[model samples]
Target: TLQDVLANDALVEFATDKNGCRFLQEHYPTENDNDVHQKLFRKLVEDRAIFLSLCSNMFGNFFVQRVLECSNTEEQEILTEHLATDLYNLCLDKSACRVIQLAIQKLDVHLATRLSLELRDTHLVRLSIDQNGNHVIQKIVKTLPVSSWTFLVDFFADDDNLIHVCQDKYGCRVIQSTVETLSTDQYAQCYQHRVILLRSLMAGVTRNCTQLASNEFANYVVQHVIKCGDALAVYRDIIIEQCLLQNLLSMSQEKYASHVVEVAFECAPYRLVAEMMNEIFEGYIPHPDTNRDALDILLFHQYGNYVVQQMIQTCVLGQNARDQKQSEMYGMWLEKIHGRVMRNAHRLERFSSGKKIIEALQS
Candidate 1:
């Protein structure tokens, strides 16, 4: 029934039909493989401006999305190739931006390259920062060859531009797309620029530790340093060996920044963790009274309590028994935390997070 209906050769009418759009979207993939599908596919590409005109429509946008997503590779390129003059126009429309992303992603390497060159000198750099259109540039960054990506990366060629893009809510996703692509597709030719691409991202975090590390948008891109795995040793080294660990004491206290420290200890170099323990221990007093007082500082509020949990959970915090120099660091904090829990059970009872410290020590 589905195939029979799809073969009826009425795609344009259905593509624009609100009630019919969803039904056609459901069957477009299978229909694209059939003989009748080619006729309508060719017809849409031939009527380029009309097809793009519909792409900005609510239901018509779904039909356009289906054609881009489900069409054969040859058919996709054939369709996207007709939109050169209108690519920027499509990118500027809210719904058209979604379809343009799929077009750039599905277009052949050469076609994508052509689209990049066409727009690179004009509106491309500006849209790379736009909310709706930024996603299209990210799609291009993700799918194009490493050499092709130079234009996008070049948009942020200097430190000021790089920092601004990383903090820009939409633009950061463009940067995130680059790392995410590298993380999943290691063997692509882009591997040649692996070091270079990552360094651009590195400069974003290092421009200013406090501002970027805690910034709502930039913090995510910064934390991915360890996320790309050990292959990016240089980037990871830049984070821990330079600014990241050196400043955890100040950063961990911020309401929105505890995750940065948590991610750091989760995958940071073993040497970095050991160094952190060494530094924290050297500053702490082992006197029982002062050690107990430390709990008061951590459990005094919500954010401080999170830092206490982060220390308890960090793998390298108290791992060495042979080196007792900092052993008191973990024990003193945990003990002081537990004592506070016991002494303030009534107040701690009403608090949900107090349960975290209790279960943490029991484990």
Candidate 2:
């Protein structure tokens, strides 16, 4: 019976000839008998050799589209895996390219997991030879958790085009997607990979983007380093002093010192502030004068007032005439410097200690 079935050319021809028409009719049969026609047609397409031989092309396309349209995650899992493997094997046939991409796009997590576990470098190498290979690899990478991202970070480290492809458009998206879907531990792995990627970018620009050199990448690196608490271990002072200072200070020396004092008062450590104030006063006092410039007078007066207020709040000073007199003297000195520093010290301060103040404040 099996031999007879194979040998029956007429039966084969009938099945093949009628397969497409039968499928369509079943899918969209006349209102009255549509269900009956569809059932009968599907039966024939599934049964007869003639139908397969004659309608192979149409059936293949139809099957591929149905696989792509499948929304049931389980069915999609099976279908996409089979399609990816088939298309990968027959890659020379360019018509299958879109199908391959679609299958990869539609693959479920289970299928993706299996593919990652099973697929090898040879498979990736073969896929890479294709014009759209990067796209396929990206999909695969996206499906993988931290393990895949780590592999990709290393894999594309030397491949500029691949890295660009992953990052400029889809890399961030892939990371976000993994973070959303993966376990917390897995997400941590992904974050590690990102840190590595950023470091690589810094190293590359420092070595290659000479015009911008370290300056170009320095800010970005510093930001990440600060976030990761890595900056403190490496170049804490350099980053704070050189990088941050350049961004905040102006070219004018006079304005620089004023900004530095204001910023330090607002944010720097108390000890550093006290030390800077002493330096400013020491620098401005000319021999035998002990007289301060207008700017120094104003800054020191304000500094003294703040210190007195803090001392009072903490009850560090006794409520005596001596303390009261010291406070009054500081207040008077502040007023005097307010005007004098503006007049005389502005020029000297701008040239002498402005740069140092800016650097110290940043550090």
Candidate 3:
């Protein structure tokens, strides 16, 4: 069956067929016949064009990866060398990127370094922001030792470069992965890199906290930076002082920015939570039409209602073993929230968001 199928067409034709390629991948790792394995491997790897065709095919890429899996060190050199010649281009193709991800993940240090080096600075940034290619970059950083990709760390250390990725739809994910990979674990090799990268991110976020928090994609990066690690203290001050304190009401009312506001409630310390609650309760402008204040306004507002729910859940209102004086403040705030909801129980019952707030109070 194998010889008849191999003789039917050029090896690449079978490589691109969904069933044919999967068939080959399934057998390449298990097929123990030396003569048969050599025939299949030579047909696939000997021709540069056929090899690239397999590497780029939607179906064929899997077989190519299997070849990489079954191939020895000398065999890998032939494969990765061909891959290195077209590395940048392959990194952009949707199917091809996964092949490269496997190559870098499994290749020897020198071979993987050779492949990574083909991505020049221009190519690297372009790939980091691409939907298909970003995963390759993420895989490289994750699989390689920190010493190998410090070029990436250097790229991100610059505020302009860091912010550029932080704002991209795909690049934001790369940024999140970069953040997670460089943890604050003191004994880990990435600790120093983590601090350097975090400081770079801090500068970038501080400069654009308001702008980033309001963006559809960039907001997640900012939220992650807030809750990431020991840096929460500074990030809290940066978010509250630079963004949320003066603009709390407007941020709460926004569609995307409201998520950041919700995280701020969850992550901020008790004192900051108290201060924010005070702002929400006492600082919002009264409506000219109905003369309603902040609580009443947000209670019925669509996006703002979620912000209020987060506040109620995180604030020290009903939690036991509370500060005596702040407990009084919390008690008063709780009563006020209940009083407002009860007063408008009939009207509030109509809206879904209002129903959630009522449920939150009961909890």
Cα lDDT of all candidates, in order? 0.66, 0.38, 0.77
List where candidate 1 sits over 4 angstroms from the true fold. 1-14, 19-48, 65-78, 122-131, 183-192, 284-296, 299-301, 315-355
Q: What lDDT is reached at residue 50 by model 1? A: 76
TM-score, candidate 2, is 0.34
- Candidate 2 has which clashing residue pairs, if any? 12-50, 15-51, 16-50, 16-51, 26-38, 294-340, 294-341, 295-341
lDDT per residue for candidate 1 within 5-57, as digits (tens), equals: 44675655676788778877775545666765665566567676777777876
Quick one: how many clashes does candidate 3 have?
0
C-alpha lDDT (0 to 100) for residue 62 of candidate 3: 92
RMSD of each: 5.5, 15.5, 3.6
Comparing 1 and 3 on lDDT, the stronger one: 3
lDDT of 2: 0.38
- The candidate scoring highest on TM-score is 3
The full ranking of all candidates by lDDT, starting with the best, is 3, 1, 2
Listed in order, each prediction's TM-score against the native is: 0.73, 0.34, 0.84
Over 4 Å off, model 3: 1-9, 29-39, 123-126, 157-164, 184-191, 227-237, 283-292, 316-318, 321-329, 342-350
Question: How far off is residue 231 in model 1, in Å?
Answer: 2.3
Higher-scoring candidate on lDDT, 1 or 2: 1
What local lDDT score does residue 38 receive in model 1, on the 0 to 100 scale? 64
